[PDB]
Amino acid sequence: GSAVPFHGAHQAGIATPVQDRLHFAAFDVTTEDRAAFVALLKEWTAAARRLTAGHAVGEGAYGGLPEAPPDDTGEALGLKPSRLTLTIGFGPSLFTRFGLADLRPEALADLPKFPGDNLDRARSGGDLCVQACADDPQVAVHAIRNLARIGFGKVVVRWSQLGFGKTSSTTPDKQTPRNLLGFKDGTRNIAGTEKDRLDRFVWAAEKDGTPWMTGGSYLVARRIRMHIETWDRASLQEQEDVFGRDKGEGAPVGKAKERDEPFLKAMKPDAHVRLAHPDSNGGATLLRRGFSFTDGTDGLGRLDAGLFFLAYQRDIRTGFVPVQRNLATDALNEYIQHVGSAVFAVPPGVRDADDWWGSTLFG
Amino acid sequence: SAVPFHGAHQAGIATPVQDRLHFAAFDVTTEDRAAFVALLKEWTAAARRLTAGHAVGEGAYGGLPEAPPDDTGEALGLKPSRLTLTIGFGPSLFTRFGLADLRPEALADLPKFPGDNLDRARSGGDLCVQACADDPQVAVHAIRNLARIGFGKVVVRWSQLGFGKTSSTTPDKQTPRNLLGFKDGTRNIAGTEKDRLDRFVWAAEKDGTPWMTGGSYLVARRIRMHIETWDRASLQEQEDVFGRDKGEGAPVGKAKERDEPFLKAMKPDAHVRLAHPDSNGGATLLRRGFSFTDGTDGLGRLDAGLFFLAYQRDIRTGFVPVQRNLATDALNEYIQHVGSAVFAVPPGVRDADDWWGSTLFG
Ligand code: HEM
Ligand code: HEM
Numbered sequence A: 001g002s003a004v005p006f007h008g009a010h011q012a013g014i015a016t017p018v019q020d021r022l023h024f025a026a027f028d029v030t031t032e033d034r035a036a037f038v039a040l041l042k043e044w045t046a047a048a049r050r051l052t053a054g055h056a057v058g059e060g061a062y063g064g065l066p067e068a069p070p071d072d073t074g075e076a077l078g079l080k081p082s083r084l085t086l087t088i089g090f091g092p093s094l095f096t097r098f099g100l101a102d103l104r105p106e107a108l109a110d111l112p113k114f115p116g117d118n119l120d121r122a123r124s125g126g127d128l129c130v131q132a133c134a135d136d137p138q139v140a141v142h143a144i145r146n147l148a149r150i151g152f153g154k155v156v157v158r159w160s161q162l163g164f165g166k167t168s169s170t171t172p173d174k175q176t177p178r179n180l181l182g183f184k185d186g187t188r189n190i191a192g193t194e195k196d197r198l199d200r201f202v203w204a205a206e207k208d209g210t211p212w213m214t215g216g217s218y219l220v221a222r223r224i225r226m227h228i229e230t231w232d233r234a235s236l237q238e239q240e241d242v243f244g245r246d247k248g249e250g251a252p253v254g255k256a257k258e259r260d261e262p263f264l265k266a267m268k269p270d271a272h273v274r275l276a277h278p279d280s281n282g283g284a285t286l287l288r289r290g291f292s293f294t295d296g297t298d299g300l301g302r303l304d305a306g307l308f309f310l311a312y313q314r315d316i317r318t319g320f321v322p323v324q325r326n327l328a329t330d331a332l333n334e335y336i337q338h339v340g341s342a343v344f345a346v347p348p349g350v351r352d353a354d355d356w357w358g359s360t361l362f363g
Numbered sequence B: 001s002a003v004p005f006h007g008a009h010q011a012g013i014a015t016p017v018q019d020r021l022h023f024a025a026f027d028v029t030t031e032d033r034a035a036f037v038a039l040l041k042e043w044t045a046a047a048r049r050l051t052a053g054h055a056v057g058e059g060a061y062g063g064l065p066e067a068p069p070d071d072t073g074e075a076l077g078l079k080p081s082r083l084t085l086t087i088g089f090g091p092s093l094f095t096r097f098g099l100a101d102l103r104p105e106a107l108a109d110l111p112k113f114p115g116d117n118l119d120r121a122r123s124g125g126d127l128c129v130q131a132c133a134d135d136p137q138v139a140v141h142a143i144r145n146l147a148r149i150g151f152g153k154v155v156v157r158w159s160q161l162g163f164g165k166t167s168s169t170t171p172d173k174q175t176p177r178n179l180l181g182f183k184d185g186t187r188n189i190a191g192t193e194k195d196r197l198d199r200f201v202w203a204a205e206k207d208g209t210p211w212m213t214g215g216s217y218l219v220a221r222r223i224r225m226h227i228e229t230w231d232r233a234s235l236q237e238q239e240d241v242f243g244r245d246k247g248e249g250a251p252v253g254k255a256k257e258r259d260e261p262f263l264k265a266m267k268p269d270a271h272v273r274l275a276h277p278d279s280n281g282g283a284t285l286l287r288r289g290f291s292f293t294d295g296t297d298g299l300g301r302l303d304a305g306l307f308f309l310a311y312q313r314d315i316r317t318g319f320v321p322v323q324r325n326l327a328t329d330a331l332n333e334y335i336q337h338v339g340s341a342v343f344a345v346p347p348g349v350r351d352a353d354d355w356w357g358s359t360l361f362g
Helices: A036-051 A093-094 A136-152 A195-201 A230-234 A237-241 A274-275 A321-330 A331-335 B032-051 B090-095 B136-150 B194-200 B227-232 B235-242 B271-275 B319-328 B330-333
Strands: A019-030 A087-092 A128-134 A155-163 A217-226 A293-295 A303-313 A334-347 B019-029 B084-089 B127-133 B154-163 B216-225 B290-296 B302-312 B335-345
Touching: A019 A136, A019 A303, A036 A087, A036 A136, A087 B032, A128 A136, A128 A217, A128 A334, A136 A155, A136 B227, A136 B290, A136 B302, A155 B290, A230 A303, A230 A331, A237 A274, A237 A331, A274 A321, A293 B154, A293 B290, A303 B136, A321 A331, A331 A334, B019 B136, B019 B302, B032 B084, B032 B136, B127 B136, B127 B216, B127 B335, B154 B302, B227 B302, B227 B330, B235 B271, B235 B330, B271 B319, B302 B335, B319 B330, B330 B335
Parallel strands: none
Antiparallel strands: A019 A128, A019 A155, A087 A128, A087 A334, A217 A303, A217 A334, A293 A303, B019 B127, B019 B154, B084 B127, B084 B335, B154 B290, B216 B302, B216 B335, B290 B302
8 A cells, every 4th residue: 555755866666676567658759849858857757756645646636627627637536555656767769859869878778689589669669668566557557647648749658568467576575476487587686675786786876987877777678478378388397497497386496495596507508597697697687577468369369478577787788688698598488579679777766856857867 | 365166146246346357258169069068167177276276177386297287377376366257158159069049038149339349359259257356367367277278179269357446455345436537336236235136137037048047148348448538628528428526426416426316417418317227217237347458559549448347137128228328428429349248147156066057058
């Protein structure tokens, strides 16, 4: 039920405990007026401060002039904050606008092409994103819908993704959730309490070269289809060999308990965990924060499902990219396909009631 | 925690409404009646496991290394979560297995209605399974595993996820709001109302289809909302569309949500006025639908709405007259019916030896 604080050095929704639901929206900018865009960021911030406290935006959902559309669309009336977080990010394409070219962060690297991808361009990229996470899906949709409405005429929704259930953990003291392949996903991640690891691996620092991004992070989103029919035909041992962990307990091969440290050399050479581990990737460590999805059927008799992968890191070049490169030979590749992608620079936090999303970028 | 699976009636009709839905329509590929009965028995056994929070078959792990696990594993560590699994039989089922004359007359095909825009690929179906639970992953796991168990005998035609309230934080007695921001459910048949269920929801033997006694008939409509145009309407326009105020949800002229409506005070094509039993020869529904939000369409607009479900004793005396009377509804400007199906939902699984469809198949 409770609220997650909206203000801080960092935006919430990163280190925060992972909530049950996701509504992620990517927007494109339509206005060429920088002052109008700044005004939108401030109005959006004000809205987010209301939303994340369980309050209606603007002057509320009713009680205004009868002839006026309500300021808030009303479907969150009577609900709780439900741990809603709203996290904004700026895509590389934003920096072509508003005289921002020289402020594009070097750590906001475009991804290379990866073997096997079939990326839907229409559901990739975006000038900006808002990640809405909450325990109540109606709270999350209300937030996105009202931000979109506020932004009408200045931004448009390019694409969106709903996540029905989490597949990630920033809280190793709680149960690790399972993805739709049936495996625990999030055992060896980064905890919200691991201050030093967050500083090392997640938060941008001023000396990294982009002052406005200090206390921000960089986000990679990958929409990944799962080949459920093929997976579900695989043997237990094939599935366990793919990952390098057993399925029921989720321990590394040869170990009895989920959180026992892996002995990588006992895994298959191609195993996902072996290839993805920091030790395989120059120490590169990610904060994974994704969710599962299911998008109807394939039209031909089969349920369609997948995982909407999210990773936060201090630098895309030393986080996602080396890891995904090392997954070129991953045994998992037989059962997945990346079908959408985007990257964003997620600014530092909203410091207090007078601050606003993007203030360090825009001034 | 759990809702009992066995009973005179299938659970998921009159039982308390859960927070989440995974609804699947299936088409039958087998022509062999004995093989189909064998599937119904296997599905029943699976449903007994699933609704008690247990893995299907021999489980999700621990079996022979070389064998695919019987259960795909994504519900391990979760709870029963009030899961119910409710099966229904579409009109098209009855053209198989020599069942033709056992198609109930109360399982009427819907007429075409003004403004319909039905996607035929997301309509119909030989069978349905309505999975409802508080944890969406529990519902998805159930549908995924039933589909897996049935593969070779059935395929999935279409699939819809939905949500209502989140009961951890929202009082059970509080009426849900739909995505237009209005309370939705105020005047409905509740599963507590045993006498009203016998009048309006359960099929009786005397109604003409003995195998259906204690079953019900289900209408599903996938109803998209034009969210952005709705949100541009004034508060008074919105309230006029329904005949209730938005904040409290009281009828025009009344102070409280649950005060009985005075229909004459509503506009003549207000939704409540057109939908009320008094306007429809006494026709009364058990509405049991769920909101949906599926994404953004190819114009940037929200793909969202109501996955409307109604249970009734006879489609001809329930949904059809009411929907016909919505032809001039002021709501029509803001909605579009884009998927549809009907199903005969049999009586319950009476005990541990019984199986879904036993009254139909014998
Ligand atoms: C549908 C796709 C994916 C599935 C099903 C999946 C599944 C898993 C599972 C079951 C684990 C073991 C438990 C744990 O989190 O420690 C794991 C670990 C991991 N995954 Fe994935 N994963 C997927 C995609 C990716 C991608 C795209 C990346 C990065 C490019 C990635 C990076 C990692 C990392 C870094 C670990 C932890 C390794 C360690 O330090 O022990 N995963 N994944
Ligand atoms: C997206 C579409 C729809 C929306 C947003 C909607 C919304 C509402 C709302 C807000 C109410 C008032 C509160 C309540 O008593 O539940 C209501 C009542 C009702 N609706 Fe709808 N409805 C929709 C579609 C339908 C359809 C398709 C039918 C049947 C064909 C239907 C039948 C009813 C009935 C019977 C009532 C109760 C009237 C009474 O007895 O007072 N609705 N609906």
